[PDB]
Write an enzyme that holds these catalytic residues in place. Sequence first.
Site, PDB file in Angstrom:
ATOM      1  N   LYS A   1      26.991  36.327  64.105  1.00  0.00           N
ATOM      2  CA  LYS A   1      27.415  35.049  64.217  1.00  0.00           C
ATOM      3  C   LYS A   1      28.544  35.050  62.835  1.00  0.00           C
ATOM      4  CE  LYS A   1      28.577  30.793  63.804  1.00  0.00           C
ATOM      5  NZ  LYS A   1      29.436  30.164  62.756  1.00  0.00           N
TER       6      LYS A   1
ATOM      7  N   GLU B   1      21.649  36.112  50.277  1.00  0.00           N
ATOM      8  CA  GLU B   1      22.637  36.326  49.440  1.00  0.00           C
ATOM      9  C   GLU B   1      23.217  34.856  49.058  1.00  0.00           C
ATOM     10  OE1 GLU B   1      23.012  39.266  47.801  1.00  0.00           O
ATOM     11  OE2 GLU B   1      21.371  40.091  48.854  1.00  0.00           O
TER      12      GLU B   1
ATOM     13  N   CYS C   1      31.947  36.134  46.239  1.00  0.00           N
ATOM     14  CA  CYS C   1      30.294  35.733  45.831  1.00  0.00           C
ATOM     15  C   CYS C   1      29.807  36.435  44.368  1.00  0.00           C
ATOM     16  CB  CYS C   1      29.209  36.398  47.079  1.00  0.00           C
ATOM     17  SG  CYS C   1      29.411  38.113  47.141  1.00  0.00           S
TER      18      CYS C   1
ATOM     19  N   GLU D   1      28.486  26.505  40.660  1.00  0.00           N
ATOM     20  CA  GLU D   1      29.766  27.477  40.952  1.00  0.00           C
ATOM     21  C   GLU D   1      30.846  26.838  41.638  1.00  0.00           C
ATOM     22  OE1 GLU D   1      28.706  30.901  43.682  1.00  0.00           O
ATOM     23  OE2 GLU D   1      29.616  32.139  41.863  1.00  0.00           O
TER      24      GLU D   1
HETATM   25  S1  LIG Z   1      30.864  39.133  48.379  1.00  0.00           S
HETATM   26  C1  LIG Z   1      30.816  41.215  47.856  1.00  0.00           C
HETATM   27  C2  LIG Z   1      32.210  41.217  47.005  1.00  0.00           C
HETATM   28  N1  LIG Z   1      32.735  42.710  47.050  1.00  0.00           N
HETATM   29  C3  LIG Z   1      33.459  43.018  45.906  1.00  0.00           C
HETATM   30  O1  LIG Z   1      34.179  42.285  45.247  1.00  0.00           O
HETATM   31  C4  LIG Z   1      33.828  44.471  46.199  1.00  0.00           C
HETATM   32  C5  LIG Z   1      35.297  44.786  46.117  1.00  0.00           C
HETATM   33  N2  LIG Z   1      35.718  45.888  45.457  1.00  0.00           N
HETATM   34  C6  LIG Z   1      36.114  47.181  45.806  1.00  0.00           C
HETATM   35  O2  LIG Z   1      36.551  47.342  46.677  1.00  0.00           O
HETATM   36  C7  LIG Z   1      36.704  48.015  44.421  1.00  0.00           C
HETATM   37  O3  LIG Z   1      35.619  48.194  43.626  1.00  0.00           O
HETATM   38  C8  LIG Z   1      37.898  47.883  43.996  1.00  0.00           C
HETATM   39  C9  LIG Z   1      38.313  46.439  43.542  1.00  0.00           C
HETATM   40  C10 LIG Z   1      39.123  48.312  44.613  1.00  0.00           C
HETATM   41  C11 LIG Z   1      37.884  48.474  42.510  1.00  0.00           C
HETATM   42  O4  LIG Z   1      37.856  50.024  42.932  1.00  0.00           O
HETATM   43  P1  LIG Z   1      38.798  51.152  42.292  1.00  0.00           P
HETATM   44  O5  LIG Z   1      38.745  50.777  40.865  1.00  0.00           O
HETATM   45  O6  LIG Z   1      38.140  52.524  42.758  1.00  0.00           O
END
Ligand SMILES: *SCCNC(=O)CCNC(=O)[C@H](O)C(C)(C)COP(*)(=O)O
Lengths: 82, 581, 581, 82, 82
Positions: B276, B352, B386, B483
């Site tokens: 969904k 989550e 999140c 938040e």
């Molecule tokens: S709600 C799930 C949220 N997920 C995130 O914020 C994860 C996104 N982060 C990444 O893809 C990497 O950790 C980044 C920001 C590119 C840094 O990695 P790089 O220093 O290898």
Amino acid sequence: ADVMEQHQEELATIEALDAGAVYTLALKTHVGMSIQTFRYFAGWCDKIQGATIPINQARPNRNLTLTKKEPVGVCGIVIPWN
Amino acid sequence: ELTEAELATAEAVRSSWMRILPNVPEVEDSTDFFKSGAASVDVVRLVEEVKELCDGLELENEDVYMATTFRGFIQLLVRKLRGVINYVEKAVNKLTLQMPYQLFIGGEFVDAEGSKTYNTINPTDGSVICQVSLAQVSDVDKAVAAAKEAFENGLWGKINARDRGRLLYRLADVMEQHQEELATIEALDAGAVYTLALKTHVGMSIQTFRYFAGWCDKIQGATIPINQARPNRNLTLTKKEPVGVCGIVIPWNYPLMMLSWKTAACLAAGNTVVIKPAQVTPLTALKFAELTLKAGIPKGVVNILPGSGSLVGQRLSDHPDVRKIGFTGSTEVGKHIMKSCALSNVKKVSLELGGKSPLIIFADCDLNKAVQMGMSSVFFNKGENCIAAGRLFVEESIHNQFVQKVVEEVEKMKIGNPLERDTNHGPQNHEAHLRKLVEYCQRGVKEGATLVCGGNQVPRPGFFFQPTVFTDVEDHMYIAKEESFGPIMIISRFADGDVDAVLSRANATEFGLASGVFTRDINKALYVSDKLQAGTVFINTYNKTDVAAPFGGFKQSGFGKDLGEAALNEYLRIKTVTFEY
Amino acid sequence: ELTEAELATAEAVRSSWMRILPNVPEVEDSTDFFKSGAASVDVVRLVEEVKELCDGLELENEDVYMATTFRGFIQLLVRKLRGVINYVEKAVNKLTLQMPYQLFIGGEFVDAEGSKTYNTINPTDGSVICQVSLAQVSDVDKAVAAAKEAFENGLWGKINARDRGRLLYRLADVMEQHQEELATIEALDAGAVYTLALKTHVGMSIQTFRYFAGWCDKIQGATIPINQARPNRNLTLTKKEPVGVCGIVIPWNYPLMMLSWKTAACLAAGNTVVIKPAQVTPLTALKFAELTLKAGIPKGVVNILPGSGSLVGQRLSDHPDVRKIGFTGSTEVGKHIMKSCALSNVKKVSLELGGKSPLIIFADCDLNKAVQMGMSSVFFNKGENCIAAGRLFVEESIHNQFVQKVVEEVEKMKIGNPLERDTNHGPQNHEAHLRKLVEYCQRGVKEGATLVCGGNQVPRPGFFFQPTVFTDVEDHMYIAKEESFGPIMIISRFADGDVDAVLSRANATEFGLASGVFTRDINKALYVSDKLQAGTVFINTYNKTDVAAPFGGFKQSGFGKDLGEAALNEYLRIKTVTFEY
Amino acid sequence: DAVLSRANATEFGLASGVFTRDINKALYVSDKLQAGTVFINTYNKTDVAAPFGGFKQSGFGKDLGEAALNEYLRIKTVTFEY
Amino acid sequence: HIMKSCALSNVKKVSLELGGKSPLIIFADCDLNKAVQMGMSSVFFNKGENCIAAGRLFVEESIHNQFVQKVVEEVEKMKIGN
Ligand SMILES: *SCCNC(=O)CCNC(=O)[C@H](O)C(C)(C)COP(*)(=O)O
Ligand SMILES: *SCCNC(=O)CCNC(=O)[C@H](O)C(C)(C)COP(*)(=O)O
């Protein structure tokens, strides 16, 4: 381990006479970690799990695969003097 | 019909079967290949034998397993020898897009009950970007039926785990080919910046499917050593089986990523899925559904139903065929899913429900690194994250120095069209959310928090918002507790060399998903890492999740992980076979 | 040189760096990208920015990590903007082959010390199929140097585990594209039948690399809960690191498969490798080395040295840079490897020294299924199999019935050219081996083994051998004890309902790699499965290994597994970091 | 890097240590040190659960912990078809 | 010599813990007072007889003279006897 715990002051004394390890240290280390070791590995005995592997089914015939962790047999341990 | 040329080949194929199969007294029309006695080597010896007779042919091992009987095989062989999706075109970012605008039920794009549609909004412009099909209760039951058909009767269930992986890995390679396309669609639909969309939104989506594809054929059970009923022997083992049908619901902050996180886990376990997607961001999910056909996923495995949350999401929890829900979104809606899960068929649930992630900063820290990470904690993917840094507990020795650096660096952050590479901070999603952020900042000032910069909408076409900062923030205030879910840095002072005092304040929150701490001192870092009540602690970094690293809530943030080895154990179940001999 | 057009772009790239990086007071020639403070998002924001300036370009994230400084970046960017392997051709099986005939040291085909060569034999004809480069001691040290260079200094070590997987998965997809080519080379070099070569020799090779690629980024360590030195805290964890350089030696029975089994495990762990292919069958390994370049494996990772076993294999055990050997072959040669491993630098060792694998058959069995599996146990891949069924303990109630069925089915088995699809039983490998099998059967009849059928060379051009059968075989005889390594079924009677008696005879063997038992009765099956002293037991099947299923010797057959999760733990080492705070 | 070059320059390498507050040094040095049992801000802090073994000439095959069992066990691999 | 005989016999398994030469780096970031007691308790532990004994102590030049001078005082305190 519980039997070695009862005779821990005895083993600690024997360490001091035989090896020369200090009686205070012998209780904490030489006898202490010996007791801990047997208590630890005793725990492991019945948690030494194998694995059921998901493998290529000879389709349409099914194929179960698993691993048993068996004992080797006889162990010839040799230990140092320290 | 069967001509003379086809009969000549048919008798040669009969002549093969006689030689291939061991006993085979007569190769009748009715006679089967495998029942007679045929190993997997004999399947390849068959196909290669037929490729000598017919020059072109192009036959594979798949069709031999399907067509077991002689009638079925000759009918299939003769058939191939003698023997369209509705898009919305749009030329932007030097790419002619092909976004599907319909449902996706059993490898087939179809309209809703009565062709009921709704507008999906482009937050760059504000104008609509095609009408998407609104899913109904009648359509949901077809999807769940198609899922249950695919799992039980269909091809998905029959094939090996290694096979499911080979398909799921190709799905990633197909998503890699259309990664610039997906990145563009993200920018138009969600408002995620094109540079970030490649690295995060599409990048981790690709990584996720590549990861879980790998897992498929390594999901090992266990042979347990148990009390032998002496002198009789007792073998015990566990099989890790799939649950069945998975009713995934995803949030709007990450359209494609959050889909992959949950989907790839289910499909790797060996489950059919009924996704969904969020009402406000469906286009990525619908584009993903197009790719499943190209990858070669059986029809009925993946099912996608864009629509209202109360209509679609509530039916999945009620429907007894579905044995798994994986909701992620708001807390008040999320609890209503778990309530219906109980009064239905005791289905498994993983939540989550946002968070309120703290981020402590000590004087031991580098400062220059704290700034860029302090921004990249809060201001990351248009603030819509999140695991966004809620409160920033900065030390009193370097509060004035830290804030003054941020204000300079905030003014540098480019704001504009998310397709353009210049842009750093993109526009928000749906307008409904934008107006809430304005009231949030208004409430912050009204409560009694020093608005340093931002805290209002940018007068410009689109749904943009200024990178906001708040200083002098007590624990009793609203913005400290609740938040933002937006680009709002909420800084808080704490005394010099007060480790337990700030931890008391940091942990004082019923929400606790992620957290962080910047420091050189290893004694502080490792101590604070233990004490912080959060499932994803960071040290000298932030937003550094990975597809292999597990990730989940603790308190009101929820339970049941996503990503990593732990993720599978949700969407699997553990049978326990026991013998005696 | 730097022209006017290049200077215009260079200053725009400098203007980017100013905007991308946070503090960056001045972007000097010397100034670095990452030292200043750059996340992985900034690498993608850089590349995409340059693709606006330059239209074509075709830039990737890899080169940004290499060229960190401004000088290095502009030199690399300008270079590409302004800016041959010797084969042996052979047209057979409707395919123009391209078999390399040289060594392979550091992604480069080179000749030996003095261009010293030898003939590799085609057992179909008997005639030579090109000369191959004989490796010397001087060449070995270059390979080990190239391996040590690649591991320590090179790119292999630096990149992520997930990256190594993505390369190793592409290696499988490259081997999939050239699977018909590899299958042909197997038939010419080894003599393995083309139909079998696709399913087994090349098929499991592909599966193996696809499998272990998956593992790369899931090789998890462990955080141990240990005695806290109260009230001080103590964190402990394990890192699973690669060992370094792996000196693999492979047998001749499976050229490409046994290579993959060991290689893929090493490369997945994150090791550079120095493969030693069998003298008599190198061409598959050399062809595999060609594919590593196409896949995009860093040069120095894979190293291949065809030559004599005593010359090459002995140097690897001596050389102190190599930290791992994985020998598989004869017992007397394999023990000599382990001896030299001790007197060097106590390097690790894993051995698969043959196996006189028993195969019990009860009256409960189906019989018709026992025959085809009884053949497919012994007569599989020209009889040349390390888990080939040594003795067949068939029950006295169905000894005469079983043997009489086999004799009929043996006469059906087609013999001839292995490229042709008609052929079931192919010719043997090297000729040296064929003459030993003739003496083996002669020695059987001499010591009192009833030659039912076969047991002599076929009057034909090539090195073929008749599918042999022996009956009325006591435990004291030679053929009962010593392994054949050929298509020689060795049947033995046992009394009706004597489970422990036959197990005593079956386990009475110092070699015990694999085993089997055919029966319907679950009480017998599961009992016999426990009692049989063999690492790979089968039930109602045989030669049913898998890349996920572990596989190894027990007694003199050896130790240290290959395939499955266990395989990695050989080619890994476990560091144990411990903190206090 | 200079001291790590000197520290790792040894064919024997069982255990090692490093005392520092700076986490960047500690975790970096922990990776680079070629030894099976690294310590940080402590030493002789082994445990019965924590695995322990050599790398280079110190040897191979662990003792203590879950890894210790895998030496003195062997893994049978049963496979069915049905 | 044990591993050599293990080869030419019945190809049995072997696990080795052949001493070592364990380094111990000490940076200026360290506490110093904690480095001393651990620096002693690394080397001088169980009468010095330890397979993971601190071989070489790579102490930094900024706190070499200060470190050594503390150890010499603390070594004289260490009681010796029965
Ligand atoms: S709600 C799930 C949220 N997920 C995130 O914020 C994860 C996104 N982060 C990444 O893809 C990497 O950790 C980044 C920001 C590119 C840094 O990695 P790089 O220093 O290898
Ligand atoms: S020395 C290692 C020997 N390996 C083997 O004999 C394994 C070869 N076997 C296979 O590839 C499959 O098990 C075959 C024979 C194709 C049967 O599998 P199918 O019934 O799915």
